[PDB]
């Protein structure tokens, strides 16, 4: 857990980046066949 806490700060930054990427992917899916695909 102490080692994991250092890992967790790095992971939290990675997780925020991943969440932003996921939101962008969801917006792309939302954007006819294209509207249905978006």
């Amino acid at each position: 857990q102490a080692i994991y806490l250092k890992e967790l700060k790095q992971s939290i930054k990675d997780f925020t980046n991943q969440v932003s990427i996921f939101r962008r992917d969801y917006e792309k899916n939302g954007p006819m066949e294209r509207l249905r695909r978006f």
Binding site: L5, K9, K13
Partner: protein
């Protein structure tokens, strides 16, 4: 014991600078220190932690 008490009341009232009060202060300080370390470490580890 053979002693009868109509009403018995136990309460959390402490006078200033009591021996018991010092122990309570230590408990608050220890909890605060853990909270202070946790808040500072998370704030230090992250960038501009809110």
């Amino acid at each position: 014991d053979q002693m009868i008490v109509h009403f018995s009341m136990d309460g959390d009232y402490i006078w200033k600078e009591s021996n018991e009060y010092k122990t309570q202060e230590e408990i608050r300080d220890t909890k605060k220190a853990l909270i202070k370390e946790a808040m500072r470490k998370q704030e230090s580890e992250e960038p501009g932690a809110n």
